[PDB]
RNA sequence: CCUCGGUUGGCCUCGGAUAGCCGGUCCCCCGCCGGGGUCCGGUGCGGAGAGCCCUUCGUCCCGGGAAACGGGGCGGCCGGA
RNA sequence: GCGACGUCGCUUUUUGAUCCUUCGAUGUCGGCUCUUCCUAUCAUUGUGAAGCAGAAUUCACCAAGCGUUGGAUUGUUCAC
RNA sequence: GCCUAGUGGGCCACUUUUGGUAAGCAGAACUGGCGCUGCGGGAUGAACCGAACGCCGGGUUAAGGCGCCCGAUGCCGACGCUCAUCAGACCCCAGAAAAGGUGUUGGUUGAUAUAGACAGCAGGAUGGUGGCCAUGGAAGUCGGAAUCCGCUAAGGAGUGUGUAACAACUCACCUGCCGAAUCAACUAGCCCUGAAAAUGGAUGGCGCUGGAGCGUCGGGCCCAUACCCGGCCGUCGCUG
RNA sequence: GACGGCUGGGAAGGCCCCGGCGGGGAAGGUGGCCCGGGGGCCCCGGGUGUUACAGCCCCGCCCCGGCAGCAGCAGCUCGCCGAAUCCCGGGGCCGAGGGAGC
């Protein structure tokens, strides 16, 4: 089996609104520059970034 | 489960001319003709064999409540066949304890006049279903004979007599008087 | 899993991450019936986490591929051994189906369980699906099609296209 | 301009939904033979549904309370009205576009009646499910003109058979006329056969 | 009395779906509402096809219930269903519907004039037969 | 002359069944031409609403087809709650 | 016909619990009068079951159509 | 860094949680809401779901839906289940349980089956034995202790009606027709019983049963002030 | 409308037992043979059995057999795609700005 390399680029789209967001999730989203619904950013993937996406 | 096919065939005698217009069955014998309709069931009625020897009933793609209506049609057509060949004779007996039940038959055997059922002055008038002959049997003291070709009219008329001679406001296990269906046979034996 | 559309069967092979203790971990193969490979890999981690002490973080997936049917033109009988949770209790079942594809058989099983038992796809675990010959079937709704000269009509042909005129003169024929 | 619908064999709500949409889209609708409308479910169930309708009245003044019409025409009319927005001017005009009848009255007995296969009993019900008759339900709840409607309907049907036998005589005369003139219409029949209007 | 039965070898006419307007041979039945069909001469691949979209025809091939596409084509081209289907009134009133669909405006004008004549030539002789009935009924 | 407006060719009609229908037919059997058994066709309804009817730019010459029993229009009889 | 030891409910014709509405005011007990509604039916209609022989009485079903009184004592509801 | 208004009655929800039989009850934690806030959806609605708002045009969506009210399935949508003489119909949420059903559908376990079953229709039910013990007598035929044999296809020292005790009759058991499945115990879906309140009545209504119901799913479509594009206004920033 | 990539370097399938020569097998059992009855030799039943007067499944290469073709001309047997991707056409809404110079 050839296992491909784990991907290093992710495109993240915020799909919920700005209403009723818990403050940890809201903080990670503004650190991800996703402050509107349907805003998109490219995120490079490592353990620190994947654990933030895991929060949100 | 939808069973793909339930069929049952009925053998038809030489004495009987049978016909079908869709899901009505027209049975012809020595004693007359019987029509019964079956459009409430949605089956296939096939009339197979030349000289019309077997009547076959099919139910395609039926659940249990639709499969149960195949043998019902076959038993109804069989009862019509024995109605036109041998007839139906329901022999009722009039059980009394102290007051003899006096039965008078009127209008060719189409009305029953029941008197002195438990010493009542009320006279019960039971009109027969059309085509059912009603008769007091000879060589037997308290008996009455119903004769016809439709079993569902002969037995309904017997039920009408039976539920007309009913005891009220007493214990019916002690007050056993009434006119009850005792024998179920044919008019003409074989 | 939400059993969306036609399921697809996936060979998903996974293993642990090679620690200095276990230099090469054993490899585990599972057939997952899933809408797509992302859901297939998630159900693989569900089942492997239930069977072994292996997680997605401690493990990896070395292969995930759709396994095509070798005879999608041949009518086969399928035996599916089932584990599901009702509202009270968990039950083992065995069910039998008839299809051309084992993925079609499993999605037929999922909709059939949803119909007959009000059970959703998250509460249903496939354990084994095997193509069974016609002699070894136990279900009469499958066994009634085991006839070489099979013959049935289509009795009460309901009128589809109920709105092609929506206002016609002639009442329809349902006998054909 | 008028959509005349034979009410026989139709289901009440399905026909009333389609009629309500047509009178909202601005088409005058006449539904004839409303005693022939069928209602799904067993007759005792439907009878107790209309009996529960009858039990409702204004407790202080039933003459102001809900009017339980007994004719099948007016019952079907009430179902279409409940399917219409009848408390606005568009709703009232939609209702006024709709005529309902018992039997087939003399404006519409010399007229072809339309049928809606999406509302028919034979299409819309499984053959083993038991249905009810609007005329029988209506009569048993208080409609008085069931028997006289039946007598006028057999009076209409026996004249409709006369019209039908004459129409059949005309059409067999039409067929003998085609085989008579198939020499001088053969050069015009081929046009209608090549463009698919005949065979 | 049913005449059209789903059986191995019945030609069915596909009413809707992607293979509408075509003829298939019923090769096997799978369950209550689906059959493995195969049209090897009408360009339909062997596939599961539901019963509600096929319409049964009065043509029955003889092949086994698991025989492959070439034996199906052997039976089809031995029975010549491509011409016997065309000889029926069913395919003729399909192609008449197709021709009335393909009518152009000049076609509709020529149809209107030819029908305008044919109806009047029939209509005079209809009344001629009617009064030839009344003059000979007395 | 005001005013209310909508509309932009008609369908002049079996009863109905839906595990069945439709149309012809006599050598029949019953009735006051109507009904049924027989036979012949039709049935993804083509004696088809996936339909039918009408179909219009107008006038002038001459010819062919179709019509002549016709086209247009004043005196009588039937047809309807 | 009952039914212990246990257990599941219903109802708001009991008293509680709570304090949501009303303190720029919703007239606070009884009885008299009068109308209507409910059924968990005492009687009457139709019924089934009894350790229902008859009579009487129980238990149950459809059932609220029609009835369910005159008085002594007490302000009484209740009670007798 | 200064000055500083208003506030210092709160309430609701997931999860945790104390008192209380419980409560639209009283009291805490965490976070989010409502208050302070319109909008699409939940028929209706302080708090639920979606989403937060300048004035507009086009497009698209979310959550919800698409028989008619009422925009949208008028798809030739898929596979089943289900009949209710009290059907069912969508978070909050607006009404039900234990128990029960040869209603109907599935599944589990075990037998009893072509070394031919299960009904159903008939036939045999034997001698030892009419058993010691009790009881007047009980002889398989009130009771308790005995529960073996053989000719066997079979028959228990007998499952029941028998009689003062018997005689009789009946059952198991074993054979004839018969020709493909059958019996039992459970379990889970829908439906039904359980299930009774007062003005007339509420899946929102009409109504719906080849669903317009329930479960699992597919295409398509509908539109919010949400998102994109564009206009216009203002504000802020670029200490432009 | 056209092109291409990948996969199990697609899976199945198509043509030349109609792939050749062998070896078997069993059934949702084809011919035959036997039984049974229903017609005017035929059909439907029940039994037996292994190719015959149908078929199915398991040197299979006798160069992955040899050819087509290939995520397939319907405008459908099952995908993910596009630096391994482009062309063409139609419908709707809008025209903000106003000294850019050469
Ligand atoms: Mg939210
Ligand atoms: Mg008494
Ligand atoms: Mg006040
Ligand atoms: Mg006041
Ligand atoms: Mg007041
Ligand atoms: Mg009661
Ligand atoms: Mg609190
Ligand atoms: Mg408080
Ligand atoms: Mg405040
Ligand atoms: Mg705020
Ligand atoms: Mg808000
Ligand atoms: Mg609501
Ligand atoms: Mg949420
Ligand atoms: Mg907009
Ligand atoms: Mg809505
Ligand atoms: Mg903008």
CB-based contacts of E116, cutoff 8 Å, min separation 6: none
Helix axes A47-55, A23-31, angle to 10 degrees: 130
Q: Which of A56, A50, A55 is nearest to A10 (CA)?
A: A50
Residues of chain E positioned with their CB less than 8 A from the CB of D189: 118
Nucleotides of I under 7 A from a protein CB: 7-8, 10-16, 18-19, 27-30, 38-40, 44-45, 54-57, 74, 76-79
How many other CB atoms are there within 10 angstroms of residue D85's CB atom? 14
Q: Where does residue E131 fall: left (phi above 0), alpha (psi -120 to 50 degrees), or beta otherwise?
A: alpha
Q: How far is CA B165 from the centre of its chain?
A: 20
Does residue D126 sit at the B interface (CB-CB below 8 Å)?
no
Q: Which of A35, A32, A23 is nearest to A51 (CA)?
A: A32
DSSP annotation of B189: -
Resolution limit in angstroms? 3.1
Residues of chain D positioned with their CB less than 8 A from the CB of E134: none
The environment of the single-atom ion ligand 1, i.e. residues with CB closer than 5 A, is A 20
User: Which contiguous run of DSSP H or E holds residue A37?
Assistant: none
Let me know how many helices (H) and strands (E) chain D has, helices first. 8, 5
CB-based touch C/D (3+ pairs, under 8 A): yes
How far apart CA D15 and CA D4 sit, in angstroms, is: 12
> What's the distance, Cα to Cα, between the start and end of chain B in Å?
42
> Beta strand E23-31 with D38-40: parallel, antiparallel or unpaired?
unpaired
Q: In chain D, what are the helix, strand and coil shares in percent, each to the nearest 5?
A: 55, 10, 35
Residue B110, Cβ density class (10 Å: 0-12 exposed, 13-18 middle, ≥19 buried): middle
Is C24 within 7 A of strand H by CB distance?
Answer: no
SS3 of residue C97 by DSSP: strand
Task: Give me the count of residues in chain B.
Answer: 190
How far apart CA D2 and CA D9 sit, in angstroms, is: 20
How far apart CA A40 and CA A32 sit, in angstroms, is: 9
Q: Where are the alpha helices (DSSP H) in B33-88?
A: 64-67, 70-85
Q: Are B118 and B179 in contact (CB under 8 A)?
A: no
> What is the residue whose two structure tokens read 């406001």?
B169
> What's the distance, Cα to Cα, between the start and end of chain D in Å?
31
Bridge partners of D13, per DSSP, are: none
SS3 of residue B126 by DSSP: strand
How far apart CA C134 and CA C142 sit, in angstroms, is: 9
Q: In chain B, what are the helix, strand and coil shares in percent, each to the nearest 5?
A: 20, 40, 40
Span CA (A38) to C1' (H228), Å: 10
> Beta strand B88-95 with B54-59: parallel, antiparallel or unpaired?
unpaired
Is C114 within 7 A of strand H by CB distance?
Answer: yes
Bridge partners of C60, per DSSP, are: C15
SS3 of residue D74 by DSSP: helix
CB-based contacts of D103, cutoff 8 Å, min separation 6: D32, D33, D35, D149, D152, D153, D156
How far apart CA B22 and CA B9 sit, in angstroms, is: 17
Q: If you measure CA to CA, which chain C residue comes closest to D120?
A: C171
User: Which contiguous run of DSSP H or E holds residue D145?
Assistant: none
Span CA (A48) to C1' (H31), Å: 24
D65 HSE (CA, 13 A, CB side): 12
Is C101 within 7 A of strand H by CB distance?
Answer: no
Helix axes D134-141, D43-55, angle to 10 degrees: 40
Residue B189, Cβ density class (10 Å: 0-12 exposed, 13-18 middle, ≥19 buried): exposed
Find the nucleotide nearest B174 (Cα to C1′). Answer: G53
Tokens of B109: 């055997």
Find the nucleotide nearest D125 (Cα to C1′). Answer: H210
Q: Which of D44, D30, D40 is nearest to D10 (CA)?
A: D40
Q: Where are the alpha helices (DSSP H) in D67-185?
A: 72-83, 89-96, 121-124, 134-141, 147-181
CB-based contacts of E33, cutoff 8 Å, min separation 6: E50, E51, E52
Tokens of E132: 């030839």
Instruction: Give CA separation, D34 vs B158, D104, D151, E44, in Å.
Output: 41, 9, 15, 48
Sign for the pseudo-dihedral over CA of D152, D153, D155, D156: positive
CB-based contacts of B163, cutoff 8 Å, min separation 6: none
SS3 of residue B80 by DSSP: helix
Find the nucleotide nearest E22 (Cα to C1′). Answer: I74
DSSP annotation of E56: E
DSSP annotation of B6: E
SS3 of residue C143 by DSSP: helix
Q: Are B5 and C152 in contact (CB under 8 A)?
A: yes
SS3 of residue C122 by DSSP: helix
How far apart CA C116 and CA A42 sit, in angstroms, is: 46
Calculate how far, in angstroms, residue A21's C-alpha sits from the geometric centre of ligand 10. Answer: 13
Starting at the edge strand found earlier in the chain, the sheet holding C28-34 runs: C28-34, C8-16, C59-66
How far apart CA C175 and CA D159 sit, in angstroms, is: 30
Rounded to the nearest 10 degrees, how much is the dihedral formed by the CA atoms of E12, E18, E22, E26? -30
Size of interface C-D (CB pairs under 8 A): 36
Tokens of E127: 């009344």
CB-based contacts of E66, cutoff 8 Å, min separation 6: C74, E27, E28
How many other CB atoms are there within 10 angstroms of residue E14's CB atom? 20
Q: Is D191's CB within 8 Å of E114's CB?
A: yes
Is C73 within 7 A of strand I by CB distance?
Answer: yes
CB-based contacts of B140, cutoff 8 Å, min separation 6: none
SS3 of residue A15 by DSSP: coil
Which of E31, E46, E55 has the CB atom closest to C98's CB atom? E31
SS3 of residue E102 by DSSP: helix
CB-based contacts of B59, cutoff 8 Å, min separation 6: B3, B5, B6, B7, B43, B44, B66, B67, B69, B70
How many other CB atoms are there within 10 angstroms of residue E58's CB atom? 11
Q: Are B100 and B179 in contact (CB under 8 A)?
A: no
Closest-CA distance of chain E to residue B69, Å = 18
Residue E112, Cβ density class (10 Å: 0-12 exposed, 13-18 middle, ≥19 buried): exposed
User: Which contiguous run of DSSP H or E holds residue A24?
Assistant: helix A23-31
Q: Which of D54, D28, D31 is nearest to D119 (CA)?
A: D31
> What is the residue whose two structure tokens read 């054993």?
C26
The DSSP line for B8-42 is EEEE--TT-EEEESSSEEEEEETTEEEEEE-TTT-
The per-residue b/e assignment along B118-155, b for 16 or more CB within 10 angstroms, e otherwise, is beeeeebebebbeebbbeeeeeeebbbbbbbbbbebbb
The C-alpha angle with vertex B24 and arms to B18 and B26, in degrees rounded to 5, equals: 30
How many other CB atoms are there within 10 angstroms of residue D172's CB atom? 10
Find the nucleotide nearest D59 (Cα to C1′). Answer: H199
Closest-CA distance of chain C to residue E57, Å = 10
E30-33: long-range pairs with CB below 8 Å, 24+: E30/C75, E30/C98, E30/C99, E30/C100, E30/C145, E31/C98, E31/C145, E32/B2, E32/B61
Is D120 within 7 A of strand H by CB distance?
Answer: no
Q: If you measure CA to CA, which chain E residue comes closest to B2?
A: E32
> What is the residue whose two structure tokens read 């051994």?
C81
CB-based contacts of E25, cutoff 8 Å, min separation 6: E9, E10, E11, E12, E37, E38, E39, E40, E61, E63, E72, E75, E76
Q: Are E25 and E77 in contact (CB under 8 A)?
A: no
Residues of chain E positioned with their CB less than 8 A from the CB of D197: 96, 100, 111, 115
Calculate how far, in angstroms, residue A19's C-alpha sits from the geometric centre of ligand 9. Answer: 22
Q: If you measure CA to CA, which chain E residue comes closest to B22?
A: E1
Residues of chain C positioned with their CB less than 8 A from the CB of E66: 74
Q: Which of C29, C38, C37, C32 is nearest to C9 (CA)?
A: C32
SS3 of residue B56 by DSSP: strand
Q: Is E1's CB within 8 Å of B2's CB?
A: no
Q: Is B61's CB within 8 Å of C155's CB?
A: yes
Task: Give me the count of residues in chain E.
Answer: 138
The C-alpha angle with vertex E32 and arms to E30 and E36, in degrees rounded to 5, equals: 30
How far apart CA B80 and CA B28 sit, in angstroms, is: 9
CB-based contacts of D91, cutoff 8 Å, min separation 6: D84, D85
How far apart CA A11 and CA A1 sit, in angstroms, is: 27
Q: Is E32's CB within 8 Å of B46's CB?
A: no
Rounded to the nearest 10 degrees, how much is the dihedral formed by the CA atoms of D159, D161, D163, D166? -140
The C-alpha angle with vertex C88 and arms to C82 and C91, in degrees rounded to 5, equals: 20
Q: Over the Cα atoms of chain E, what is R_g?
A: 22
User: Which contiguous run of DSSP H or E holds residue D198?
Assistant: none
CB-based contacts of C40, cutoff 8 Å, min separation 6: C8, C10, C12, C32, C34, C64
SS3 of residue E109 by DSSP: helix
Tokens of B68: 């149960």
């Amino acid at each position: 089996f050839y296992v491909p390399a784990e991907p290093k680029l992710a495109f993240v789209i915020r799909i919920r609104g700005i209403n009723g967001v818990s403050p940890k999730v809201r903080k990670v989203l503004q650190l991800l520059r996703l402050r509107q619904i349907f805003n998109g950013t490219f995120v490079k993937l490592n353990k620190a970034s994947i654990n933030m996406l895991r929060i949100v | 489960m939808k069973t793909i096919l339930s069929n049952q065939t009925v053998d038809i005698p030489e004495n009987v001319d049978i016909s079908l217009k869709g899901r009505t069955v027209i049975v012809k014998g020595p004693r007359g003709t019987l029509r019964r309709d079956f459009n409430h069931i949605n089956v296939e009625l096939s009339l197979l064999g030349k000289k019309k020897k077997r009547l076959r009933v099919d139910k395609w793609w039926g659940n249990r409540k639709e499969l149960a209506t195949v043998r019902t049609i076959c038993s109804h057509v069989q009862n019509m066949i024995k109605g036109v060949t041998l007839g139906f004779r329901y022999k009722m007996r009039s059980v009394y304890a102290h007051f003899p039940i006096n039965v008078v038959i009127q209008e060719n055997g189409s009305l029953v006049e029941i008197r002195n059922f438990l010493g009542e002055k009320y006279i019960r008038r039971v009109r027969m279903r059309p085509g059912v002959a009603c008769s007091v049997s000879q060589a037997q003291k308290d008996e009455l004979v119903l004769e016809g070709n439709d079993i569902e009219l002969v037995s309904n008329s017997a039920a009408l007599i039976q539920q007309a001679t009913t005891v009220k406001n007493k214990d019916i296990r002690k007050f056993l008087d009434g006119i009850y269906v005792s024998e179920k046979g044919t008019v003409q034996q074989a | 899993m939400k059993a969306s559309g036609t399921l697809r069967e996936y060979k998903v092979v996974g293993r642990c991450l090679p620690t200095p203790k276990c230099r090469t971990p054993p490899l585990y193969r599972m057939r997952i019936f899933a809408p797509n490979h992302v859901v297939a890999k998630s159900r693989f981690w569900y089942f492997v986490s239930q069977l072994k002490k292996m997680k997605k973080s401690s493990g990896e997936i070395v292969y995930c591929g759709q396994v095509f049917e070798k005879s999608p033109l041949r009518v086969k009988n399928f035996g599916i051994w089932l584990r599901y949770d009702s509202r009270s209790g968990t039950h083992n079942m065995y069910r039998e189906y008839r299809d051309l594809t084992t993925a079609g058989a499993v999605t037929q099983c999922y909709r059939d369980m949803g119909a007959r038992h009000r059970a959703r796809a998250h509460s249903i675990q496939i354990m084994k699906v095997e193509e069974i010959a016609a002699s070894k079937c136990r279900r009469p709704a499958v066994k009634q099609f085991h006839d070489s000269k099979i013959k049935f009509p289509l009795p009460h042909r309901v009128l589809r296209r109920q709105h092609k005129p929506r206002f016609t003169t002639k009442r329809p024929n349902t006998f054909f | 301009q008028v959509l005349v619908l034979d009410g026989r064999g139709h289901l009440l709500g399905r026909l009333a939904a389609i009629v309500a949409k047509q009178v909202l889209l601005g088409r005058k609708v006449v539904v004839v033979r409303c005693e022939g409308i069928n209602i799904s479910g067993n007759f005792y169930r439907n009878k107790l549904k209309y009996l529960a309708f009858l039990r409702k009245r204004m407790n202080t003044n039933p003459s102001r309370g809900p009017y339980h019409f007994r004719a099948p025409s007016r019952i079907f009319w009430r179902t279409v009205r409940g399917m219409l927005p009848h408390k606005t001017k568009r709703g009232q005009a939609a209702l006024d576009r709709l005529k309902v009848f018992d039997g087939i009255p003399p404006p519409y007995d010399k007229k072809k009646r339309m049928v809606v296969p999406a509302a028919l009993k034979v299409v819309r019900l499984k053959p083993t499910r038991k249905f009810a008759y609007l005329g029988r339900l209506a009569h048993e709840v208080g409609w008085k003109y069931q028997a006289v409607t039946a007598t006028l309907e057999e009076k209409r049907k026996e004249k409709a058979k006369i019209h039908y036998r004459k129409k059949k005589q005309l059409m067999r005369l039409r067929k003998q006329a085609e085989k008579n003139v198939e020499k001088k219409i053969s050069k015009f029949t081929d046009v209608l056969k090549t463009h698919g209007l005949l065979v | 009395v049913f005449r059209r039965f789903v059986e191995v070898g019945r030609v069915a006419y596909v009413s809707f779906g992607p293979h509408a307007g075509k003829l298939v041979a019923i090769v096997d039945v799978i369950d209550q509402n689906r059959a493995l069909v195969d049209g090897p001469c009408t360009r339909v691949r062997r596939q599961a096809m539901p019963f509600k979209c096929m319409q049964l025809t009065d043509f029955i091939l003889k092949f086994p219930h698991s025989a492959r596409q070439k034996y199906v084509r052997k039976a089809w081209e031995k029975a010549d269903i491509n011409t016997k289907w065309a000889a029926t009134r069913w395919a003729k009133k399909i192609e008449a519907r197709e021709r009335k669909a393909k009518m152009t405006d000049f076609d509709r004008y020529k149809v209107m004039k030819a029908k305008k004549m044919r109806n009047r030539i029939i209509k005079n002789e209809v009344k001629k037969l009617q009064r030839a009935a009344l003059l000979k009924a007395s």
